[PDB]
A paper describes a structure:
To further explore the quaternary binding mode of the nanobodies, we solved the structure of α7∆ICDcryo in the presence of a sub-saturating concentration of C4 (10 µM). 2D class averages show a minor fraction of particles containing one or two bound nanobodies and a major fraction containing three bound nanobodies. We selected these later particles to solve a C4partial-Apo structure. Without imposed symmetry, we obtained a final volume of 4.4 Å resolution and, after map improvement using the density modification tool of Phenix17, we were able to build a model where the main chains and most of the side chains of the α7 ECD and the three nanobody molecules are confidently built. For simplicity, we labeled the three C4 according to their position in C4-Apo: C4 chains F, G and I sit above α7 chains A, B and D, respectively. Interaction determinants of the three C4s with α7 are identical to the ones observed in C4-Apo. C4F and C4G interact with each other in a similar manner to C4-Apo, although through a slightly larger interaction surface (~260 Å2), while C4I sits alone. The F, G and I chains are more inclined toward the vestibule (radial angles of 129.3°, 128.8° and 126.0°, respectively), compared to C4-Apo and C4-Nic (133.4° and 133.8°). Therefore, data show that the nanobodies can bind independently from each other but that their orientation is constrained by the presence of neighboring nanobodies. The C4partial-Apo structure shows that C4 binds in a sequential manner, a process requiring significant reorganization (change of radial and lateral inclination) of already bound nanobodies to accommodate new ones.
The human α7 nicotinic receptor is a pentameric channel mediating cellular and neuronal communication. To develop a novel class of α7 ligands, we recently generated two nanobodies named E3 and C4, acting as positive allosteric modulator and silent allosteric ligand, respectively. E3 and C4 bind to a common epitope involving two subunits at the apex of the receptor. In this study, we solved five structures of the α7-nAChR in complex with two nanobodies, unraveling a common epitope at the apex of the receptor, which is formed by the MIR and the N-terminal helices from two adjacent subunits.
Residue numbers in the entry:
A (entry chain A), C (entry chain E), D (entry chain D), E (entry chain C), F (entry chain B): 1 to 206
B (entry chain F), G (entry chain I), H (entry chain G): 1 to 121
């Protein structure tokens, strides 16, 4: 059938350790955006904070292409965790024991199109809770995301705004906003602009 | 099955001739596949002759056909050409092409076959 | 041996990433139900509660069919996780340190094909507890089940009634009812809807 | 080497998803019995009980057969998890997050063909600790074992008497007896019994 | 290169679940000697204790032999967990939830020689903390080690004295010594015996 | 294209249990340097402390070689966990229940072959806090790193200076510095050294 | 050793002859092994003929041999019989039988092979 | 690119005297690979004649011959020599070289194959 034929044919030569791009010199563009649903707790002096976040990563793959003219029906295909490439965007200043709370999910592809890798999770991340200036002080906590191995001239990770959806108003903390900013880190001997993203959560009290 | 291939050109010169074999196909996008030429003898295995990758510049020749046979591909015309010069009388066999997904021409897992044309010298 | 022959023959081509259906464009129908067994506790300050739920998913397969006239004996077959298709129906507002508390089990198939999947689960989900004002206020906690990647023209998630058989009466709360409702959400710009099932747990106090 | 030859030859066609029996219509007899060696915590009215129990499963296989004349010396064959069929008999009213406490172990096989499966476990079950008639009141707690997918004319779960050994006399509770009874959870219209085994533990106080 | 050839040549037929011995009737010799590094806590009246122990195993193999004359350089090879045989010797009175708390380690082989398997572990064992006199009395806890599936006429488990190396003096308990004893107990209806090794840890108080 | 060719052709004969070196007699140099980021807690009399540490391991490989002239573009190849040799270097006096808090990571290689194996982790390690002479006294906690299976004339560990980066100014403890030095524990048998590295973290109250 | 697989029943007969091909074996337990007949001829490599299961029910044949031959076995004598009827000139080949563990006659992994009993017309 | 392995020698001399043949490399690095010699005959398929390692001294031979052939290799010239002494009439075939990455000579994978030279005493 069409589904069986397409799924069997799509993986002829697809070594999962690749960086799909027509020209090896040209970098790849990945889009990153997060949606924060809830805040669990600010925790103790240990300077650690727990949240509930769904991430969203998108990129254009040049090794999964066809056209629907000769393959009527099929319009969205899915691949599991282990056979389709996925960028390794992680949290830098993580404090969880496992360092990665992402519940891996299938990767979605449309026609001759790009991918979406929405992972859910709860993140226990470190902060600087030192607002003892006065109990009523606005605290800024930073979530630092970025690549761990790839960087510079290979992945020009961009940023998209976060979401302000039904964030379950907390009974003790309220947030003013969630800005984000892309940043660069120079190296000892190189001109490659190693990128990263920092999202700031600011809250005073409730 | 809408994925078949056809040949254009025949060779029966005595020796030292020139030829231009042309091959074409339809039913799949002629931009995500690479084509390689294969030869079959009466009794023998299959041998690799000439190949080119999907990118456009990865020309590969066998060890015995380095400076004689050349290969090219026209994406807009949807065709592949093989030019033979200074042929030897030991090349008597059936030539057929095989396609494959993104590759280079070196050993791979071919998907679509075709049918061959006979050259007698 | 007939069972051995059947198990060897049935898997000639069953790429596990398939959607079993004769007509690719036609959608599949999946029936969903749950059975509550117990409620463990609902802490106060944090918004989370624990429940004991056995799920029940039923669907119709097409590539797994035979007729018993030629094969005497076997009437039902069981498949583990990894070799058979199973829809990914998950809980949205999860709060555990994991996104899936399901203890996977085998899938049962009979004759022409009808798959029953019964996972147990100790689910921990986030509720909306804001009824501290009146101690005698009924609390409507929400359990939101649905597909994570599949949706629209592919999986027509139906709904069956819940179950009351056995409850292990609690010492602090009492069940009033277990209503459930299917809902749909429309994407940004598309005619494909996204369905989901919401179950309301109502308890006043004890 | 005889060991290597036997191990190589015994696994020619042994798909581990199959029920071993010469005639597939005939049911299969499985002997089941447990042996509790320790008690960890009965807990307060939270309705949870922790016990340390070693299971014991035995059955007869018709696909592991030979005689010693051909193969001198060898009398016991040991198989890990994955390559040998094992019944999936579980605890119905479990409260553990993992839902399973079995530490999978190798299975032993004799010449003529027999199986012995002895997994240990720390079982966290559910009970009703509601002794309000003064401290002295006998409490009966139940453990419900049975198949999760097999049932009726396929596996007739036979019961053996429990074991009373090295119970580490406790200082807070004492065991009066360990009865065990087989019952049938037959549904409305099935024409095929669904057996199960329930074990009762009785303790008043100390 | 020589190491590559040795590795590719020594695993031609090494079914991991075999018992490598020259004679199928002759038993095999295994030497056992734990080394205790620290006791973490004697814990509450639940009769549990947490200790830090590095176990030790020694046995002789018949399928791993070469002559070092033609292989200059390499003298010791090492195998990961899964490809090399390892005896199933573990703790009996285990109170840990996962039972076995060993971090698996590579196995070392020298020339036509033996194997060493050094696992580190934190063991939650249970003993008899019921001091006869008032709470200040000398308690002797027992650690039991033996095979689970192997036993009698196959592994004549032998004991060697423990170690008194750096003990990290705790602040509330002092030990007297750590003797051990090999016992050929539990000679059941089967003719073969069932050897075991029991170590005694004695401490009164500080 | 070229990336796929290189990835497919580079692993023809790479038995992952290798010790890459041109000559089997010459040892291998492994450069080690750690970087601490924060101190979470000192805990209680159990004499254990928690830290966040990123390791840094560097070595040179001989079987991963090419030159970029014929492979335009690709300059860094990346391998996952399992297909690439990694030295088995870990912590001796580890007090965590898992004995390995390393979140495994990809390995980066370049044309010549230099490798980097930076893992992140949260390390819970034991110490000795029993300074009764003066409650306000500087505490020196030791971390002992080194191999577990390899040792002597095969892998000679070398140490690089540590990192004093943005160590999140704490609120109860302040450190002066982190000296480290190489040590040896040469055994009586044979004359093969047993190297290791010891890092002392010296902290005083704040 | 001790796994001898012996056959008999050589024949040079034209169409219309009835044959009682016999095979015997030893060493292994005959009641726990299925058997299948294979054909090898110089023009080809190997092909199915007919097979039995370990119980004696649901024997399997090939498309070209749906009629004609029959196959039988008796557990108490260690004999395997193939009744061949209505010969045709195309069955010029060797008949070496194969034995496997509990099987279904249809393709399976084999453990014990036999020897040839070449028959020509 | 143009990776090719050309062979020569043209040995058709009678038994007894001598034979000496050499190989060459074009595209790949000669200090990172290993070469083995394969014999192919009109009736036979493949034989592991002999081989050498990338290190330089791991000469491995076949059971057929132990003191009649010898091998040598040179990295500056990018070549390998095979010397055939005490020619006998039983070995007449086509020789070709198979190239591989870091290896020993025993069963190994290959990436590049060479040209065939016909030798007949
Ligand atoms: C790829 O990028 C390089 C960079 O200069 C360029 O020279 C080349 O033309 C591009 N296209 C290819 C290699 O097909
Ligand atoms: C789709 O692909 C087929 C391949 O033969 C081609 O004929 C057709 O024109 C393509 N359609 C579009 C819209 O690209
Ligand atoms: C599938 O359904 C469509 C509905 O529009 C129908 O036209 C078609 O014939 C069906 N069968 C196919 C596409 O094979
Ligand atoms: C069962 O299927 C087989 C195969 O098509 C067929 O020959 C037989 O008639 C079927 N029997 C019934 C009762 O449908
Ligand atoms: C198996 O049992 C059934 C039950 O009556 C019987 O008819 C059959 O002959 C038995 N043997 C088989 C199926 O080989
Ligand atoms: C094994 O021991 C038995 C008993 O002494 C002996 O007869 C036999 O020759 C030994 N070797 C074997 C069985 O290979
Ligand atoms: C190992 O055996 C080989 C062949 O039997 C022999 O040549 C070599 O000297 C032996 N090595 C030693 C150390 O005895
Ligand atoms: C390796 O080193 C040894 C001594 O250091 C030397 O004899 C040998 O030639 C070197 N090369 C090898 C073994 O390939
Ligand atoms: C680099 O690769 C090219 C590819 O042809 C080769 O010509 C050149 O010799 C190589 N350089 C070195 C130093 O090996
Ligand atoms: C063991 O089985 C073989 C095979 O059937 C048989 O020949 C032999 O007599 C049997 N031995 C015994 C003691 O039953």
């Amino acid at each position: 059938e069409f589904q069986r034929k397409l799924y069997k044919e799509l993986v002829k030569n697809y070594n999962p350790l690749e960086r799909p791009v027509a020209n090896d010199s040209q970098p790849l563009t990945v889009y990153f955006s997060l949606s924060l649903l809830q805040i669990m707790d600010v925790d103790e002096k240990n300077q650690v904070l727990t949240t509930n976040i769904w991430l969203q990563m998108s990129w254009t793959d040049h090794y999964l292409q066809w056209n629907v003219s000769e393959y009527p029906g099929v319009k969205t295909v899915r691949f599991p965790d282990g056979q389709i490439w996925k960028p390794d965007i992680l949290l830098y200043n993580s404090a969880d024991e496992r360092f990665d709370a992402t519940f891996h999910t299938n990767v979605l592809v449309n026609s001759s199109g790009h991918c979406q890798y929405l992972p859910p999770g709860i993140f226990k991340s470190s902060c600087y809770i030192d607002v003892r200036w006065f109990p009523f002080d606005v605290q800024h906590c930073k979530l630092k995301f970025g690549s761990w191995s790839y960087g510079g001239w290979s992945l020009d990770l961009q940023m998209q705004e976060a979401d302000i959806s039904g964030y379950i108003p907390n009974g003790e903390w309220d947030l003013v906003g969630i800005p984000g900013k892309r940043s660069e880190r120079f190296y000892e001997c190189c001109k490659e602009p190693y990128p990263d993203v920092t999202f700031t959560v600011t809250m005073r009290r409730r | 099955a809408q994925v078949q291939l056809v040949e254009s050109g025949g060779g029966l010169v005595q020796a030292g001739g020139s030829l231009k074999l042309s091959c074409a196909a339809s039913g799949f996008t002629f931009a995500h596949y690479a084509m390689v030429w294969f030869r079959q003898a009466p009794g023998k295995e299959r041998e690799f002759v000439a190949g080119i990758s999907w990118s456009g510049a990865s020309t590969y020749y066998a060890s015995s056909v380095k400076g004689r046979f050349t290969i090219s591909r026209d994406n807009a015309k949807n065709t592949v050409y093989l030019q033979m010069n200074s042929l030897k009388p030991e090349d008597t066999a059936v030539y057929y092409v095989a396609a494959a997904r993104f590759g280079v021409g070196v050993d791979d897992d071919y998907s679509y076959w075709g049918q061959g044309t006979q050259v007698t010298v």
